[PDB]
Design a protein around this ligand. Structure first.
Ligand SMILES: NC[C@@H]1O[C@H](O[C@H]2[C@@H](O)[C@H](O[C@@H]3[C@@H](O)[C@H](N)C[C@H](N)[C@H]3O[C@H]3O[C@H](CO)[C@@H](O)[C@H](O)[C@H]3N)O[C@@H]2CO)[C@H](N)[C@@H](O)[C@@H]1O
Ligand SMILES: [Mg+2]
Ligand SMILES: [Mg+2]
Ligand SMILES: [Mg+2]
Ligand SMILES: [Mg+2]
Ligand SMILES: [Mg+2]
Ligand SMILES: [Mg+2]
Ligand SMILES: [Mg+2]
Ligand SMILES: [Mg+2]
Ligand SMILES: [Mg+2]
Ligand SMILES: [Mg+2]
Ligand SMILES: [Mg+2]
Ligand SMILES: [Mg+2]
Ligand SMILES: [Mg+2]
Ligand SMILES: [Mg+2]
Ligand SMILES: [Mg+2]
Ligand SMILES: [Mg+2]
Ligand SMILES: [Mg+2]
Ligand SMILES: [Mg+2]
Ligand SMILES: [Mg+2]
Ligand SMILES: [Mg+2]
Ligand SMILES: [Mg+2]
Ligand SMILES: [Mg+2]
Ligand SMILES: [Mg+2]
Ligand SMILES: [Mg+2]
Ligand SMILES: [Mg+2]
Ligand SMILES: [Mg+2]
Ligand SMILES: [Mg+2]
Ligand SMILES: [Mg+2]
Ligand SMILES: [Mg+2]
Ligand SMILES: [Mg+2]
Ligand SMILES: [Mg+2]
Ligand SMILES: [Mg+2]
Ligand SMILES: [Mg+2]
Ligand SMILES: [Mg+2]
Ligand SMILES: [Mg+2]
Ligand SMILES: [Mg+2]
Ligand SMILES: [Mg+2]
Ligand SMILES: [Mg+2]
Ligand SMILES: [Mg+2]
Ligand SMILES: [Mg+2]
Ligand SMILES: [Mg+2]
Ligand SMILES: [Mg+2]
Ligand SMILES: [Mg+2]
Ligand SMILES: [Mg+2]
Ligand SMILES: [Mg+2]
Ligand SMILES: [Mg+2]
Ligand SMILES: [Mg+2]
Ligand SMILES: [Mg+2]
Ligand SMILES: [Mg+2]
Ligand SMILES: [Mg+2]
Ligand SMILES: [Mg+2]
Ligand SMILES: [Mg+2]
Ligand SMILES: [Mg+2]
Ligand SMILES: [Mg+2]
Ligand SMILES: [Mg+2]
Ligand SMILES: [Mg+2]
Ligand SMILES: [Mg+2]
Ligand SMILES: [Mg+2]
Ligand SMILES: [Mg+2]
Ligand SMILES: [Mg+2]
Ligand SMILES: [Mg+2]
Ligand SMILES: [Mg+2]
Ligand SMILES: [Mg+2]
Ligand SMILES: [Mg+2]
Ligand SMILES: [Mg+2]
Ligand SMILES: [Mg+2]
Ligand SMILES: [Mg+2]
Ligand SMILES: [Mg+2]
Ligand SMILES: [Mg+2]
Ligand SMILES: [Mg+2]
Ligand SMILES: [Mg+2]
Ligand SMILES: [Mg+2]
Ligand SMILES: [Mg+2]
Ligand SMILES: [Mg+2]
Ligand SMILES: [Mg+2]
Ligand SMILES: [Mg+2]
Ligand SMILES: [Mg+2]
Ligand SMILES: [Mg+2]
Ligand SMILES: [Mg+2]
Ligand SMILES: [Mg+2]
Ligand SMILES: [Mg+2]
Ligand SMILES: [Mg+2]
Ligand SMILES: [Mg+2]
Ligand SMILES: [Mg+2]
Ligand SMILES: [Mg+2]
Ligand SMILES: [Mg+2]
Ligand SMILES: [Mg+2]
Ligand SMILES: [Mg+2]
Ligand SMILES: [Mg+2]
Ligand SMILES: [Mg+2]
Ligand SMILES: [Mg+2]
Ligand SMILES: [Mg+2]
Ligand SMILES: [Mg+2]
Ligand SMILES: [Mg+2]
Ligand SMILES: [Mg+2]
Ligand SMILES: [Mg+2]
Ligand SMILES: [Mg+2]
Ligand SMILES: [Mg+2]
Ligand SMILES: [Mg+2]
Ligand SMILES: [Mg+2]
Ligand SMILES: [Mg+2]
Ligand SMILES: [Mg+2]
Ligand SMILES: [Mg+2]
Ligand SMILES: [Mg+2]
Ligand SMILES: [Mg+2]
Ligand SMILES: [Mg+2]
Ligand SMILES: [Mg+2]
Ligand SMILES: [Mg+2]
Ligand SMILES: [Mg+2]
Ligand SMILES: [Mg+2]
Ligand SMILES: [Mg+2]
Ligand SMILES: [Mg+2]
Ligand SMILES: [Mg+2]
Ligand SMILES: [Mg+2]
Ligand SMILES: [Mg+2]
Ligand SMILES: [Mg+2]
Ligand SMILES: [Mg+2]
Ligand SMILES: [Mg+2]
Ligand SMILES: [Mg+2]
Ligand SMILES: [Mg+2]
Ligand SMILES: [Mg+2]
Ligand SMILES: [Mg+2]
Ligand SMILES: [Mg+2]
Ligand SMILES: [Mg+2]
Ligand SMILES: [Mg+2]
Ligand SMILES: [Mg+2]
Ligand SMILES: [Mg+2]
Ligand SMILES: [Mg+2]
Ligand SMILES: [Mg+2]
Ligand SMILES: [Mg+2]
Ligand SMILES: [Mg+2]
Ligand SMILES: [Mg+2]
Ligand SMILES: [Mg+2]
Ligand SMILES: [Mg+2]
Ligand SMILES: [Mg+2]
Ligand SMILES: [Mg+2]
Ligand SMILES: [Mg+2]
Ligand SMILES: [Mg+2]
Ligand SMILES: [Mg+2]
Ligand SMILES: [Mg+2]
Ligand SMILES: [Mg+2]
Ligand SMILES: [Mg+2]
Ligand SMILES: [Mg+2]
Ligand SMILES: [Mg+2]
Ligand SMILES: [Mg+2]
Ligand SMILES: [Mg+2]
Lengths: 138, 124
RNA sequence: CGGGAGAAGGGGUGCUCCCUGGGGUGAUGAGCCCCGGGGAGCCGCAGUGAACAGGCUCUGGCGACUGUUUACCAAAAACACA
RNA sequence: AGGGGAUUGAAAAUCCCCG
RNA sequence: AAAAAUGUUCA
RNA sequence: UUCCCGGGCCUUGUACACACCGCCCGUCACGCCAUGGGAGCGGGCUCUACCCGAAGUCGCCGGGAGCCUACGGGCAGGCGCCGAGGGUAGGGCCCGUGACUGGGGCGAAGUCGUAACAAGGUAGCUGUACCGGAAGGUGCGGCUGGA
RNA sequence: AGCUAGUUGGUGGGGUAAUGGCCCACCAAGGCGACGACGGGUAGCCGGUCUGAGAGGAUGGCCGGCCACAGGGGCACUGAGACACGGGCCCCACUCCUACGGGAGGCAGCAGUUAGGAAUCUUCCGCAAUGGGCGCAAGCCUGACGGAGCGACGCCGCUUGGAGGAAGAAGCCCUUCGGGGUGUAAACUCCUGAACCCGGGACGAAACCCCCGACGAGGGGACUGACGGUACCGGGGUAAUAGCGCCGGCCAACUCCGUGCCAGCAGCCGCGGUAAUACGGAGGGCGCGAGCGUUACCCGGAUUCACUGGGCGUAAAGGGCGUGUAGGCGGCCUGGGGCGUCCCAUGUGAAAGACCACGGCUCAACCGUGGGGGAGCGUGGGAUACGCUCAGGCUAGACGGUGGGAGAGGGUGGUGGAAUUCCCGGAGUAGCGGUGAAAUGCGCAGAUACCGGGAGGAACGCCGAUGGCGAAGGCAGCCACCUGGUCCACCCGUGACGCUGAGGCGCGAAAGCGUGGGGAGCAAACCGGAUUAGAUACCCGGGUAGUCCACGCCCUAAACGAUGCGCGCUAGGUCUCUGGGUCUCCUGGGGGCCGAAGCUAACGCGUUAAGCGCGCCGCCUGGGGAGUACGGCCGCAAGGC
């Protein structure tokens, strides 16, 4: 019945990607799109858009992959080699402004929910705030 | 184990046993040699290792080994137990501190002597 | 598992005075009896002050048990018993 | 029981010989 | 669709 | 070419690998160590109850007795509650030790047989049940980690 | 694993500096507990300290802070303050004294003795400084303190020399007999000069006190040093201690002799059986050095209790299965509150220690000064994404409706045929049986084989599968009744009502047990016969409980897919059971095989996951001891948990 919808979205994404798919449709969720917007506003996916599978509103999420490769396993590298939820329903993960993560020595990101919106490992830091460490991509 | 479970049960700390009960975590323990026999090696060895049972201070009585060549412990010799298993003789879990109390140092040892309590000889 | 249980081991009990709770017949009130409870205070060596009135425990044997038996030496580990 | 010869890679075991 | 047990110790 | 002996390649099984002249099980004997049960015996901690009960505080009294007075009163002394501990009794918890008894561990070359690993030479194993020197045998049922 | 009588609360008192069953009457029956009450064990707490990359783990010795105690126990008095270590009273233990008539003492203060132990010091100097008590002050007391003494116990500084010196003494060890090594090491030559010797000699000490002013503010005068004739400065001045461990690998350092599974070594692996780099000595070498080793203990390495940071198909690990309580976790949208969460500010976070500088002793070790950081917690203001919460709404989760399906799902009652066994009857004769071969055994008292009639029990051939149903155990002849779950279709209803699940309750093969019934076949035990060295077995002939039924127990298992449940996501191919359709096809449910990506130690798994994820439960932590012992709970017992 889906306990944590968000962790799912990531997984749906983490799977569709691992096979190289055009787009994936994660179920409608304002807060979800946020992690999406951010996910794109940071250039991890071509983008997304609302749809409806018979009164069932989902969200097309277009995946971005790399260039074809030379040699065996000519499988194109991916934009997202790793996404994993942090704060889980079975163990909420909160962090203070000084506690925010440093994802992949800076190359990475760390979406998170804050009292004043949904920011990232830099944004939130710049805003100098804190909140539920939603997760981390890179 | 889930977190929730961890919250409930929780991990259990090991706590290990004393590889040698020489009482009050003591560097050494004194005692009288109740007997002084001569047992035999284990698994692949052959010889007549010299062992001696000892009535410790602590009303205890245990087998202790004896180092080097020759010695002089008798059925009633006071001695110092050091604590060092002799992996090759079942039971023997303590060595006798040579050159202490009734224990006589080793005669004519010239090499390692700190061990074996042999006095530093003069070369003249 | 009823029972071992009166296990064991203790403390109280007489007399006077004060207040008080329910009962039965009256009658719903009074005498009349019936069970209690709480405080003070008096006297002796001793208050179920005389008479009636268990000593106890641990541990073996035999027989399960209540019973029955040698009228007049044997009541049992014997007979009986479900 | 120890020691010696034979015997073994060295024993164990086995054969012969001693106060 | 099979008669038949065992083979000292350390290397 | 069935059968005895030895030898090729393919295959299968393997718990073997100084490799079946392999490996390996349990009883038994001997030695050392810890340990359970045990008629019990010894000591430590505690709980309950009632009997005696110091000092002392407090509460009465201070009467027909004493001491002081500035006559109100105070002290001494009397009684009571609380009370350390002591006694007797009956419980609870732990430690030591005990004739004998039960298994268990470990210890170069002692005894008996062959359970298991190759259909291990009756597939094996397993819950149960009975039985037998010992491994174990067999019954029912189960599993393949067997065919 | 249940605990509680001042026990929980109450009105009124008593008590106190004061709150309050702290205490006492009277009244009401409460109070606590799996968020672990009650009970046993163990323990002084913190600042910090040790280790770790950190998170953590361990620890609480010195110094600082809090508490507690003064031989064991109780009680008050005095007082601002005590139930008071060197004050008091009593009881107890202990030791002592005595004129034997009674009394005395309380080092867990300093030092010292004895006992115990592996082991822990001088019966030191001084009040000069700091601090404390009394006094107007002079000043008195101060084993607090300030110093000294003892121990490589620790830390730090420092010495046993420096520069030359042979194509290289001697001695000793190797030696392919040339030589190689110790080794510039030495001797020897020059220079420096710890020790020792003589001379000088402290800081720490300015106050209190005396005079002027006012005995104040400000100024002037005087006394005082335990350590110590020590530090330290100057002069002279002699080459002036080295040891311990190791050298097979891990782990840096090798050769000879002795010894011969002996003697011995040994942290784990291991070495020694007559050429040992492992034992013992030697030459040599490596390491550290007034130390070097050993034993003990803590952290580490050990992501080996795993939050960081692990696991359970075969390695230890899924509960035998189900139902469900507490608890844990929870779809989509709009708004209110703002507990979690987050930000700001402020209080706090002693000093010491830890980190950064800078200075003080010749340096350092110690030490001073300044700076910088501290989680946590309180108060004040603010934010609202996420968790929480209240409120309003929705239909993708979940449940229901109408209509149908398949199935060995379960319970009861009845019923059919095949076969086996026995009974009667007929017919018939010399063996049948069983085996590897046999024997036991059955048979002239008439068997086996054949037919007919009859009784009774138990199992259900073909269909049948590589299938189907059930949560598991498990469920098969046929029929009817009673009843569970599950699948499809129709978009009808409810509107998150959900997932999981400690404990609990139920079910739970076979074997086994209780009361009663039944009994053909088979069959532990048992008895014979063979086999064999033996055969308490395998094979043969007999045979009871049991296997069956009713009702009630036991509750285990290779109770296995050896794979917890729920949901989501991630190529296909193939055959098969079952449902629906404008039916060569499309779509739903289940069982098998092969396999994408990916996972795995490998084997293998692979939309029926062991892939990628989330929620919740269960469980694992080397092998043997042992699923044993004890305790508890259950059972009639066997036994189980
Ligand atoms: N580890 C042994 C344990 O006890 C048993 O094993 C014990 C016995 O079976 C075994 O005895 C063996 C014997 O089996 C074998 N056939 C002959 C051998 N000589 C005996 O040996 C025994 O005794 C001699 C002295 O006589 C000792 O030196 C030796 O160490 C010891 N194991 O000795 C063992 C005790 O050391 C179990 N069977 C075993 O499964 C269990 O694990
Ligand atoms: Mg051996
Ligand atoms: Mg050896
Ligand atoms: Mg050791
Ligand atoms: Mg009796
Ligand atoms: Mg009695
Ligand atoms: Mg009278
Ligand atoms: Mg009488
Ligand atoms: Mg009479
Ligand atoms: Mg009788
Ligand atoms: Mg009678
Ligand atoms: Mg009679
Ligand atoms: Mg009579
Ligand atoms: Mg008579
Ligand atoms: Mg009688
Ligand atoms: Mg009589
Ligand atoms: Mg033959
Ligand atoms: Mg044999
Ligand atoms: Mg052999
Ligand atoms: Mg042999
Ligand atoms: Mg050997
Ligand atoms: Mg050899
Ligand atoms: Mg092998
Ligand atoms: Mg063999
Ligand atoms: Mg062999
Ligand atoms: Mg015993
Ligand atoms: Mg006893
Ligand atoms: Mg009494
Ligand atoms: Mg009194
Ligand atoms: Mg005992
Ligand atoms: Mg014994
Ligand atoms: Mg024994
Ligand atoms: Mg034995
Ligand atoms: Mg044994
Ligand atoms: Mg032997
Ligand atoms: Mg067998
Ligand atoms: Mg065999
Ligand atoms: Mg076999
Ligand atoms: Mg057979
Ligand atoms: Mg069996
Ligand atoms: Mg027997
Ligand atoms: Mg038996
Ligand atoms: Mg026998
Ligand atoms: Mg067995
Ligand atoms: Mg048998
Ligand atoms: Mg069988
Ligand atoms: Mg079977
Ligand atoms: Mg089964
Ligand atoms: Mg089978
Ligand atoms: Mg096999
Ligand atoms: Mg009051
Ligand atoms: Mg007071
Ligand atoms: Mg109280
Ligand atoms: Mg009150
Ligand atoms: Mg206690
Ligand atoms: Mg203590
Ligand atoms: Mg670490
Ligand atoms: Mg730490
Ligand atoms: Mg650890
Ligand atoms: Mg700790
Ligand atoms: Mg602590
Ligand atoms: Mg300590
Ligand atoms: Mg302190
Ligand atoms: Mg006290
Ligand atoms: Mg004392
Ligand atoms: Mg006291
Ligand atoms: Mg005073
Ligand atoms: Mg005092
Ligand atoms: Mg004193
Ligand atoms: Mg004296
Ligand atoms: Mg006199
Ligand atoms: Mg007197
Ligand atoms: Mg002293
Ligand atoms: Mg002493
Ligand atoms: Mg001593
Ligand atoms: Mg002074
Ligand atoms: Mg002073
Ligand atoms: Mg020189
Ligand atoms: Mg030379
Ligand atoms: Mg030379
Ligand atoms: Mg040379
Ligand atoms: Mg040298
Ligand atoms: Mg000079
Ligand atoms: Mg001075
Ligand atoms: Mg003065
Ligand atoms: Mg002045
Ligand atoms: Mg002086
Ligand atoms: Mg000089
Ligand atoms: Mg000079
Ligand atoms: Mg010299
Ligand atoms: Mg070495
Ligand atoms: Mg090396
Ligand atoms: Mg020798
Ligand atoms: Mg050595
Ligand atoms: Mg030789
Ligand atoms: Mg040689
Ligand atoms: Mg040699
Ligand atoms: Mg050597
Ligand atoms: Mg461990
Ligand atoms: Mg973890
Ligand atoms: Mg296995
Ligand atoms: Mg396993
Ligand atoms: Mg299991
Ligand atoms: Mg459930
Ligand atoms: Mg809940
Ligand atoms: Mg808030
Ligand atoms: Mg917080
Ligand atoms: Mg601050
Ligand atoms: Mg500080
Ligand atoms: Mg400096
Ligand atoms: Mg500072
Ligand atoms: Mg802060
Ligand atoms: Mg709602
Ligand atoms: Mg029927
Ligand atoms: Mg028939
Ligand atoms: Mg029959
Ligand atoms: Mg006839
Ligand atoms: Mg017949
Ligand atoms: Mg199924
Ligand atoms: Mg059925
Ligand atoms: Mg139905
Ligand atoms: Mg609808
Ligand atoms: Mg509606
Ligand atoms: Mg059953
Ligand atoms: Mg049965
Ligand atoms: Mg039976
Ligand atoms: Mg039969
Ligand atoms: Mg038979
Ligand atoms: Mg026979
Ligand atoms: Mg044979
Ligand atoms: Mg039945
Ligand atoms: Mg049951
Ligand atoms: Mg089993
Ligand atoms: Mg299975
Ligand atoms: Mg399918
Ligand atoms: Mg199937
Ligand atoms: Mg692949
Ligand atoms: Mg596959
Ligand atoms: Mg799918
Ligand atoms: Mg498929
Ligand atoms: Mg797996
Ligand atoms: Mg579960
Ligand atoms: Mg162990
Ligand atoms: Mg173990
Ligand atoms: Mg028990
Ligand atoms: Mg019972
Ligand atoms: Mg029975």
């Amino acid at each position: 019945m889906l306990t944590d919808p968000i962790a799912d979205m990531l997984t749906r994404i983490r799977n569709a990607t691992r096979v190289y798919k055009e787009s994936t449709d994660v179920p409608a969720s304002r807060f979800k799109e946020e992690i999406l917007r951010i996910l794109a506003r940071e250039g991890f996916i071509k983008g997304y858009e609302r749809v409806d599978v018979d009164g069932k509103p989902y969200l097309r999420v277009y995946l971005k992959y790399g260039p074809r490769r030379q040699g065996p396993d000519p499988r194109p590298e991916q934009v997202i080699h790793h996404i994993r939820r942090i704060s889980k329903p079975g163990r909420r993960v909160y962090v203070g402004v000084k506690e925010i993560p440093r994802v992949r020595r800076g190359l990475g990101i760390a979406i998170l929910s804050t009292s004043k919106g949904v920011l990232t490992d830099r944004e939130a830091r710049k805003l100098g705030v804190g909140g539920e460490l939603i997760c981390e991509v890179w | 184990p889930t977190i929730n479970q961890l919250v409930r049960k929780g991990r259990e700390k090991v706590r290990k046993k004393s590889k040698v009960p020489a009482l009050k975590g003591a560097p050494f323990r004194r005692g009288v040699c109740t007997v002084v026999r001569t047992v035999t090696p284990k698994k692949p060895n052959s010889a007549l290792r010299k062992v001696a049972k000892v009535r410790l201070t602590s009303g205890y009585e245990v087998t202790a080994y004896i180092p080097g060549e020759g010695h002089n412990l008798q059925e009633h010799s006071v001695v110092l137990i050091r604590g060092g298993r002799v992996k090759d003789l079942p039971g023997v879990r303590y060595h006798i501190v040579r050159g202490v109390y009734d224990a006589a140092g080793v005669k004519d040892r010239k090499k390692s002597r700190s061990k074996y309590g042999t006095k530093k000889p003069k070369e003249a």
